Amino acid sequence: PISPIETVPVKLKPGMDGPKVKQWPLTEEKIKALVEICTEMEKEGKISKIGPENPYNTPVFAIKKKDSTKWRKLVDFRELNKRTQDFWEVQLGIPHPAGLKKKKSVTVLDVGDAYFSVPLDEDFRKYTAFTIPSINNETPGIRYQYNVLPQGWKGSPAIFQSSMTKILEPFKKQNPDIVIYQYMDDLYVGSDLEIGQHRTKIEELRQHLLRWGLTTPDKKHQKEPPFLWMGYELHPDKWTVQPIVLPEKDSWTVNDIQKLVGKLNWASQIYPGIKVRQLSKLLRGTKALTEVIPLTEEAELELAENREILKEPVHGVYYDPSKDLIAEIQKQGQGQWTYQIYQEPFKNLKTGKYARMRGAHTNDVKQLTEAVQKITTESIVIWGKTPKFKLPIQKETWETWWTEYWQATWIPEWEFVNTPPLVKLWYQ
Amino acid sequence: VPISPIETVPVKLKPGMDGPKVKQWPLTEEKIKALVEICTEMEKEGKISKIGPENPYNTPVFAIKKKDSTKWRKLVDFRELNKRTQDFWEVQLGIPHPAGLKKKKSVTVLDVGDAYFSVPLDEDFRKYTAFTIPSINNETPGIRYQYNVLPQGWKGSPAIFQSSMTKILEPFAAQNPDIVIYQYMDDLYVGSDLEIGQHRTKIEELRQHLLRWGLTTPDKKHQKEPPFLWMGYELHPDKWTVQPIVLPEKDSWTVNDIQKLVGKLNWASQIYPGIKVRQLSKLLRGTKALTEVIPLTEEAELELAENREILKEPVHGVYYDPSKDLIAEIQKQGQGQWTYQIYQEPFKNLKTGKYARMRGAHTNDVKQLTEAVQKITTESIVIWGKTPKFKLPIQKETWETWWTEYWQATWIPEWEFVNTPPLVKLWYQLEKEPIVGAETFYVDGAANRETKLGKAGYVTNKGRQKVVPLTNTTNQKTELQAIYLALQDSGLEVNIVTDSQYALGIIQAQPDKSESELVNQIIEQLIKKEKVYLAWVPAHKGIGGNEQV
Ligand SMILES: N#C/C=C/c1cc(Cl)cc(Oc2ccc(OCCN3CCOCC3)cc2OCCn2ccc(=O)[nH]c2=O)c1
């Protein structure tokens, strides 16, 4: 590579010390892969071994590429990100295209390798320290720090931003209707073109970037994939807040009207315009659960009125940029998961449900992992930043298995919940 | 004169700080004259150097007689400098577990003499280690020194020493890749499959290398021979175990002594199977003064008895063999306590251990089994770098049913069923749809937050009604009460309807055990029933609810 004018100096918030974070234990296999990878990177100049006088540490994991059988090293930069990018979303911050969510199709391209051509400010290198762990604490781990702009660090695309803008300029000129947004190591490219046109334009951008020096190992299965969905493509024009659905039934029992009145009453703390009065009077005196209650004219006059009041969006619900995004996920069974993305309680910026193959293929952790990735990508496309998850999983279980199914180059913040009893029936 | 031409590790003081300025006048002639004998012999060896009143900094100096009172020792309190020095990478946290070591034909322990003092200190930093021996009462220009090497007790000594030793070993470990060297604090643990002759000569080559770098190694033979008492263990050539555990016999037990006891029992549990800490640690629940006298309970003394009986005859752990499968096996002890053994072989264990659920007011057998599996998976990943095949006392369809109907996402590696009782089953299942031809109980309960009296009751579709008074209770407790009442007074199939998300929450969790007797009785009733459908409605929205005060 080359060494452009100086190196962009990186400072921190005054009184902010570098990251010191424990390295999770890894399988022998993953340690091996990390050792190989870093031996290589050491040879190429990207990282160098360090002394005991470097206290800082950032975690490192091993995932596999996207679909590939070759190992990939994923550095978890969340801490260093909070400790730098917070003033580097300010100083060097990249502006977000609110028109990206409008496009009919959006392809994500991996541009990470670019950062590796560029050196990192000397004085800053000590904060990129990571440790390859040893099995059973038999040796002190292997300790490297970065000599070049690291993937996963939010300062990396911010520093490379100008180079990216320049390289992208010609393509942007010939294609004024294509939206291009850089989030960390990925380029999000939107268009209203038909799928064939879209894919061809994306290949045009791939070749453009390629002849300007940017490799994009997003390259597909080429001539003959045996069976796959080859294109990684989103479709944000269809992405909104999923409306609440009341059960559609011919005849109703006491129990059914109870679930109905309960769910409606729950909705009332979101939509204030709901009245359950006429459904309450149609039970009254103590009855059997299985007893069938006939639906009166007034009761259904209340029901049909509460149905179309639930198809409209809420009032006063807007995105607060000074606030963190929060994503809650609830498990629905049968390979289905439902989610909400909000900021303050009961005001939902976006909700959704993402299912997959139901049985004899995938397990719970795989599903939750793909779900978190999907939601995160939607969040990037829509707001230009990732939500903090409340995950329905035991902490240690997730901390053990999340890196098996993780194909993304970024890591969202998460925390773990034991709480919700009733949201299952209500959010499905 | 054991100095060394080892590259020094560059050190800074914490940003915006300076060198310790603490002055020491005191005190006594006896010690003062004794310090010069040490200082001149250290200066000879080049470990320290005199300095001029150029206005450097200063650090306190003490002196003390070693045990048995034969040879003296010098002390320096570096606390100030230590607080003022930069942070270093953490030396080591955990230590390797013997179950994770692999059998080697020969093993040798080498302790390094003079240690830190054999390793030089960064030049520009030496001026902050400056200290002063005073005169006797006379104010005369008492000697001023400073360290050229790693000062004892200084913040940077252990880490810098470790990295120095590593760099020194590197050219030797290259020439001898088939031998394994572990590095721990001041010692080195070497091992090889080399025949005892060439091993015995290799160790000597190592000693010569080390001494060429200024580091002493034990002269007489290789010194220490198995055991090998290391960090509370006993490492034998074919086996490992814990160092002998002694459980004291006393008339009175202070919370401190119960702390020591639970400690020893826990430590023992990694190898001796069956160890139970539940009742003894339950004594320790209340967190208060450590000098308090705590009376033991009956279950605690029974537990302790069972532990004493387990500890009677010694047991041994084996070492790891990468070629052979790693298996872990779990048994329920029944008190909310689980126990497990990890082995590649039937009659010999790599190690053992226990899991006990601490948090939560109510739990589940399958959930606890899962949590245990999680603990062991983590542990195995730590120690052996992989995850074990599991042998579990749970039917496939039981497990499948649980994880499919469980709100949280759980996952298990591949496992096989073991028919060894007690097995793990679901002691009951709530109906997912209301029961036809079953009496419907509308339950409610309420209490007064001041008097704490309250009452619990039901009203049924068959016109049946009951209200029972309660004393010393709470609204949640009155609700669980109400449900219990409906369970007692109904048939084998019953539809209950409640106004409380709390009670519904406890019950839908399907617990088979709890720390409140009420929930336990409810559990018993739930097991006794053929079908129970529990359903919820908004409280005080006037549908089927009880208007009873
Ligand atoms: N004071 C005191 C401390 C003493 C002490 C402390 C540690 Cl932590 C380790 C140690 O010995 C070993 C050293 C290296 C080794 O290297 C193993 C590395 N592998 C690499 C792959 O091949 C197999 C070996 C295996 C060892 O044990 C193997 C098992 N063993 C233990 C004790 C004994 O007497 N004989 C044995 O055979 C000794």
Author numbering:
A (entry chain B): 1 to 428
B (entry chain A): 0 to 548
Question: Could you pull the original sentences from the published paper?
Answer:
Reverse transcriptase (RT) from the human immunodeficiency virus continues to be an attractive drug target for antiretroviral therapy. The drugs that target HIV-1 RT are divided into two classes: nucleoside reverse transcriptase inhibitors (NRTIs) and non-nucleoside reverse transcriptase inhibitors (NNRTIs). NNRTIs significantly inhibit the catalytic function of RT by binding in the non-nucleoside inhibitor binding pocket (NNIBP). The compounds co-crystallized bind the NNIBP causing RT to adopt an “open” conformation commonly observed for RT NNRTI complexes.
In order to improve aqueous solubility, ether-linked morpholine groups were added to DATA and catechol diether systems. The addition of an ethoxy morpholine to catechol diether compound 1 significantly reduced potency for RT (WT). Crystal structures for RT (WT) in complex with both 1 and 2 and were determined and analyzed to explain the difference in potency. Additional π-π stacking interactions were observed between Y188 and W229 with compound 1 along with several van der Waals contacts. The crystal structures could not provide an explanation for why compound 1 has reduced affinity for RT (WT). In order to explore this more, we conducted MD for RT (WT) crystal structures in complex with compound 1 and compound 2. Compound 2 maintains stronger contacts with K101 and E138 (observed in >100% of snapshots due to multiple bonds with K101), whereas compound 1 only maintains one strong hydrogen bond with K103. The ethoxy-linked morpholine in compound 1 does not make any strong contacts with E138 or residues in the binding site. The MD simulations for compound 1 helped identify key reasons why the compound was not effective for RT (WT) compared to compound 2.
